[model samples]
Target: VKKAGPVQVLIVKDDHSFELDETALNRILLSEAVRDKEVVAVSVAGAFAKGKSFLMDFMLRYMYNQESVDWVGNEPLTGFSTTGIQIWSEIFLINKPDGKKVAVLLMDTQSATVFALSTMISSIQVYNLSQNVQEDDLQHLQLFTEYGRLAMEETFLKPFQSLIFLVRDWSFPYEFSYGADGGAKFLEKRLKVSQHEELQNVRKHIHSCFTNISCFLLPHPGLKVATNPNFDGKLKEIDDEFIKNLKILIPWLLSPESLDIKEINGNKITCRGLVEYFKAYIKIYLPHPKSMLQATAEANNLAAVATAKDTYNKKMEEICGFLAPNDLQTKHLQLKEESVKLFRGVKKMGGEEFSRRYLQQLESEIDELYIQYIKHNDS
Candidate 1:
């Protein structure tokens, strides 16, 4: 309550201009919430002044509300209320249902360059939409998803974790109904591609944007929340029907099982890595969509290099885990040969120039490992 607003991790200005605050970002990173743990950042992003902030306030209330005696406040007090990217100051250390421990960061914002980069980083990105999921919505989503598709896809989604499309004030229940049951049906109908060869590929590309994409249809939160500028958000003032949907959806959205907990090329990213990702993505996608493939190829190129290296290391570990432990230089050469060959034979990597650059890193890492094996072999 003393702070009154979430930490400002990003600064937004007018039209296509914003800056990420390294100082505020690191403050949250250094907090008790991020003590050497994997982080899952759940965020809500959509058109400005929609329920994004209001929803985050409730999300906060639900977590803190369970632990509260009363009073969560209503100046629309929060990052959800502000213009820039907002990070909840309190980090929740959760015991996920998967028997994993993780720190969860709640983020909120609505900007193009800012939101798109934030979209790239979050474990779960809640994409808010107005009215029904219309054709323009599909095109808007596809534009963001298009550039991010550079390093991409083994499944319909790749590189990114989960993306959820949250439709507000849904008007199609008479035809599509409500809830996840209806949300899923509605999403499928909206995203299920077209009859033409060209248009169908567009749908498939959008589908491939995230590894696990989903949608939720929220009933309108009554006239006051939507229409009145001066209306304070009151539970009694809101419709019971909307509240029921909120009760159901929040649990589904915030559940441990639903979290994909941000990873890249099969490795968990720490807060330190997160800071770096903000910078990297912003450079590639913002201020300059520069080269067509620079953004795409750079990210994908790194993924290929990383994936190959991971395979090599896993293979090496099997033999080294229970080896004769008396390897001479000859054995080192043999291990290097197999591992080096693996990267050499990789398919669908980035430009030869880019791919080969990271390949050097992959090989050098193998050399670094062999020295460790030298010690393990009783040398």
Candidate 2:
């Protein structure tokens, strides 16, 4: 519910060598990204209490700077959090402007620090019980399974992109015998089902390319705290080699890869062909400005044209190279409405005069829709 102040603009070179508050800079760049029509992809992650919600808030506010559509703080947007998965996709569609369309995808679970802490706590309890020869008195596997279920849901389903597993500590139980790699494989098997078949296919496809599917671990702020006396010597015993090995995988973790949305034998799937399919769908749905004479005439506004182009780019990002059949259907309907409205409005105003007025209005709508898109994502 905290209010972020007004937008601040600064001129700087791309090198980022200039001195600036890195946190604020990241916020600013992310905010502008909300307005950018071409970069529709977003991945929110970090250990529990690491500010995922805060980052989302900054981006949403940055996107809707001109409007007062506070989705997360005031009134909660529909399907912001839910037990069912369909709601994430619905939320993806609802905030779209009349003309701009977006396909909302995955709703990943959230893994809270509490969950991690619980695991650590449980492990400690087991260690103590074993020492007292009372380990059999308590049910350990049941508790482990329950904790595992919550971890899977929280860490995977809360976000819209690939799972960014946030690991805060350098040491873990795996070092002894369970081993990090072994534990990782177990986690993958435990969290196998994808809500959508396309996600499953995509995973299967990626795994085929690289036989060893590795889990990427990110540094958690908690580990820094653990270095102090309070965390016992748990952090101390963790091998430096484990940290070094994990660092090598960071590049692969952050690579820019996308799923191509299309049909594979009548079933939806992602492939290189899906990219072309979405490009074609976007081209058809939103024909070049020249297709609408009045809208095209003022293309010299340059600013308006840029804004329209931005919206076009943003729409493409939302689709991210693939779209469901229903997604295209909705986009087609929106385009049809826009076409009908423009044609009628032109008739009412008489040719050239309508061109001037209508194009300006169209430009304004694109900007508004861009803001709305941000609001929707923030929700």
Q: In candidate 1, residue 11 scores what lDDT? A: 76
- For residue 298, model 1's alpha carbon misses the true position, in angstroms, by 7.9
lDDT of 1 by residue, 245-325 (tens): 887677677756665677765556555446656655656644433343355445544544554555555666676674565
Which candidate comes out best when scored by lDDT? 1
Q: Which ten residues in a row have the lowest lDDT in candidate 2?
A: 122-131
Best-matching candidate per TM-score: 1
lDDT for model 1 comes to: 0.68
Instruction: Give the lowest summed-lDDT range of ten residues in model 1.
Output: 69-78
* TM, every model: 0.71, 0.26
RMSD per model, one decimal: 7.5, 20.9
Q: Where does candidate 1 clash, by residue pair?
A: 151-300, 156-208, 157-210, 157-211, 173-177
